Amino acid sequence: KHRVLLIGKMYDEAGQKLLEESTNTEILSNPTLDKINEAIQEVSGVFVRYPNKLEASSIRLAKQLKVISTSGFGTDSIDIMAATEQGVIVVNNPGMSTTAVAEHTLSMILALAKKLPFLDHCVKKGNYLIRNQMQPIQLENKTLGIVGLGRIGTLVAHKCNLALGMRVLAYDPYVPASKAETVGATWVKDLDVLLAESDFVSLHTELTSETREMFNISVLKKMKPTAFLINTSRGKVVCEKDLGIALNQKLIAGCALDVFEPEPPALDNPLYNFENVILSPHLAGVTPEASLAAAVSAANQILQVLQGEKPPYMINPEVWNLFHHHHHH
Amino acid sequence: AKHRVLLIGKMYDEAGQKLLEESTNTEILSNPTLDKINEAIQEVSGVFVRYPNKLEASSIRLAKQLKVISTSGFGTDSIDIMAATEQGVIVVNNPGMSTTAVAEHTLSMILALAKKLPFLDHCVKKGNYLIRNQMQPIQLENKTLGIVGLGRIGTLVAHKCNLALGMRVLAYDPYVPASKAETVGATWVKDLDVLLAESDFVSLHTELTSETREMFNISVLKKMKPTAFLINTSRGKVVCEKDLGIALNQKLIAGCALDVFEPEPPALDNPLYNFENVILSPHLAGVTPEASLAAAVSAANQILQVLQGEKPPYMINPEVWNLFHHHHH
Ligand SMILES: NC(=O)c1ccc[n+]([C@@H]2O[C@H](COP(=O)([O-])OP(=O)(O)OC[C@H]3O[C@@H](n4cnc5c(N)ncnc54)[C@H](O)[C@@H]3O)[C@@H](O)[C@H]2O)c1
Numbered sequence A: 001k002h003r004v005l006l007i008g009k010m011y012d013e014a015g016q017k018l019l020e021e022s023t024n025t026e027i028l029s030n031p032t033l034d035k036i037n038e039a040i041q042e043v044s045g046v047f048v049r050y051p052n053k054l055e056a057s058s059i060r061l062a063k064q065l066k067v068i069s070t071s072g073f074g075t076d077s078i079d080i081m082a083a084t085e086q087g088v089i090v091v092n093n094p095g096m097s098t099t100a101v102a103e104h105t106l107s108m109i110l111a112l113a114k115k116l117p118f119l120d121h122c123v124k125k126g127n128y129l130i131r132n133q134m135q136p137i138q139l140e141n142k143t144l145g146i147v148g149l150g151r152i153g154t155l156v157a158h159k160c161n162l163a164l165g166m167r168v169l170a171y172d173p174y175v176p177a178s179k180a181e182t183v184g185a186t187w188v189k190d191l192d193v194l195l196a197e198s199d200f201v202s203l204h205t206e207l208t209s210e211t212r213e214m215f216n217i218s219v220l221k222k223m224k225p226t227a228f229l230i231n232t233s234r235g236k237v238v239c240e241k242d243l244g245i246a247l248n249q250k251l252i253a254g255c256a257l258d259v260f261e262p263e264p265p266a267l268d269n270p271l272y273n274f275e276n277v278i279l280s281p282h283l284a285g286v287t288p289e290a291s292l293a294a295a296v297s298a299a300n301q302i303l304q305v306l307q308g309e310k311p312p313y314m315i316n317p318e319v320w321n322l323f324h325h326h327h328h329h
Numbered sequence B: 001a002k003h004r005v006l007l008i009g010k011m012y013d014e015a016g017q018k019l020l021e022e023s024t025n026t027e028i029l030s031n032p033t034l035d036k037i038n039e040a041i042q043e044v045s046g047v048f049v050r051y052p053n054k055l056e057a058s059s060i061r062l063a064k065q066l067k068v069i070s071t072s073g074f075g076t077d078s079i080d081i082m083a084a085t086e087q088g089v090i091v092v093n094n095p096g097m098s099t100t101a102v103a104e105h106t107l108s109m110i111l112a113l114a115k116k117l118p119f120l121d122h123c124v125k126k127g128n129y130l131i132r133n134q135m136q137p138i139q140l141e142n143k144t145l146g147i148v149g150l151g152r153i154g155t156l157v158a159h160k161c162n163l164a165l166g167m168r169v170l171a172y173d174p175y176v177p178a179s180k181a182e183t184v185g186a187t188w189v190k191d192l193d194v195l196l197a198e199s200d201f202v203s204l205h206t207e208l209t210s211e212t213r214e215m216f217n218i219s220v221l222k223k224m225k226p227t228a229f230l231i232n233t234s235r236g237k238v239v240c241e242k243d244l245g246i247a248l249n250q251k252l253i254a255g256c257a258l259d260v261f262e263p264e265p266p267a268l269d270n271p272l273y274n275f276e277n278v279i280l281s282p283h284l285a286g287v288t289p290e291a292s293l294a295a296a297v298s299a300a301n302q303i304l305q306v307l308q309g310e311k312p313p314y315m316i317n318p319e320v321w322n323l324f325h326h327h328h329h
């Protein structure tokens, strides 16, 4: 029977149960490159838990490899070129946690408006009278600016408009304006207009060379001093040093972050010392439902390629013909 | 007890209908009128729509127990999605099941235009073998192919025409990264006008949207080379067919190959039937045994998923999911 290497465990054991019905699996925990190499030589499939890496030199050692599956959308730590050259199919598992991240985003937007973690701290310390200096924000009729109108951004736009009564603006050069109009948002060609008009700005872009450090001191200066930033996308989209300067200089009023750069944020991180800051440890997409759906998807696609069936989320379909040559024909 | 499912046209493989019959009672209509749909749709929980059959808003409103509409393939232009969304009805498509088939069919049509294959077959069979002394077939090596829409099919067509024929491949698609073209040896161009000026064959592979509706009109044909050919396997409404006929008459382009039409099916007296260097097929580019089986299984399984309250993989109106929940309980 075929052998599968799991570079990191899946998000739900049901995916490992699926593999074990037909394959012999070995599981490594944050393995070093050497540990991968001595475990990968006889496997037909590999699962990679984000953010683990799979290098070209390791792929070359896997002479019978048929398929590499990642745990989520991201494949940046996979050398796809190497896999393609050897007839190995790379699949991702995208969109398995859209609803979880959308809910987490609504949670952070509301908690910023209501000053919820700060008020909880104050009441528990006997500082009930903080209420005199408080002005919670009503979300109704405020403006939300969505940067990245993808799977998550679209759902967040829809619910903030329909359920919370917000005006919703969006910036995304790589979707048509009709996509925003369908959910009640307006797609804007000029990011600066969204920045000037928004009371809450929520980031939902893919991380690319173009969006890396896109949210820097120049952007924060354009935002309203009363506005808040929410980032549930990727830590590298935000320049954290500039963000701290912007909070310190009151260029924006606060922020909620689920992702960081560097990740694991340092014990030193100056962002910890603002009470208009709300932090979560990269959990926005983590629910039992999302973990199970991704684990089952990844296992099912590995099993498809081992059977010779085309999986639904191939990242390198240009490899199929060589895959055919190596393992069929 | 069993839910009812209406098929507005058959699937292309019986496997889908057998999957549905395990758990539901089905009725199959053959090219029904709007009235026949309304009679058969009143009590059904799920509908399958075989393209180009239409499902209009008025019919969706009569379907008081409707949960899910599945299209036969990627295209959803024959569905009133807005009406479905308003009623808490999930729309699923079935994308990427015909990608190799359409890419093969597109290469077939490019070659047949270059070699004048249907015309010459007719000549030999009518006794005019000696037409050969006036024929100059085109050598595809180093000719330029322009791809409009670098999606699943457009990217595979670019890859195959490079590998099989040595063609230079240009692409126009505002919504994909230039790296996607580079990976298959093509160049992504920001200005469609440049692609039109440089291409010897222009092949259409876009989604039909308000932006691509009637994109290929007389102004575009005036920009194409008089020696160039148009290939359309995407959607008929991307091409203004009356302008295409004008363009062929006025020698703005040399010929065309079409698998999709507007009016689809086309009329008995369509003027395109009478032109030189026209090659037509009846929306069969994506209809192979392999593709039909995959699409039929996918459509059946998504219908069954939604009937169970499970989120399917190809929801095209995810903003409707909460209203579906509210009705499905
Ligand atoms: N915090 C978590 O636990 C978690 C979980 C899942 C996803 N994510 C991240 O959240 C982000 C959104 O996820 P998704 O599934 O909606 O992605 P998606 O691929 O569906 O959408 C990404 C969108 O970003 C847009 N984009 C690219 N460049 C842009 C630019 N310069 N400006 C504006 N928009 C741009 C793209 O056009 C796309 O519509 C991603 O970064 C994803 O990695 C985080």
Ligand SMILES: NC(=O)c1ccc[n+]([C@@H]2O[C@H](COP(=O)([O-])OP(=O)(O)OC[C@H]3O[C@@H](n4cnc5c(N)ncnc54)[C@H](O)[C@@H]3O)[C@@H](O)[C@H]2O)c1
Residues within 6 Å of the ligand: B073, B074, B075, B095, B096, B098, B102, B148, B149, B150, B151, B152, B153, B154, B172, B173, B174, B175, B176, B205, B206, B207, B208, B209, B211, B212, B233, B234, B235, B259, B260, B283, B284, B285, B286, B287
């Ligand atoms: N038998 C057949 O003829 C057959 C079979 C399958 C699919 N199709 C059709 O072929 C088309 C492509 O299918 P696919 O699976 O590759 O879809 P896809 O979603 O993978 O690709 C469509 C591409 O169109 C591009 N697009 C959107 N707007 C554009 C614009 N203004 N200009 C240029 N490009 C734009 C998108 O960005 C996308 O990359 C669809 O119209 C589909 O309905 C036909």
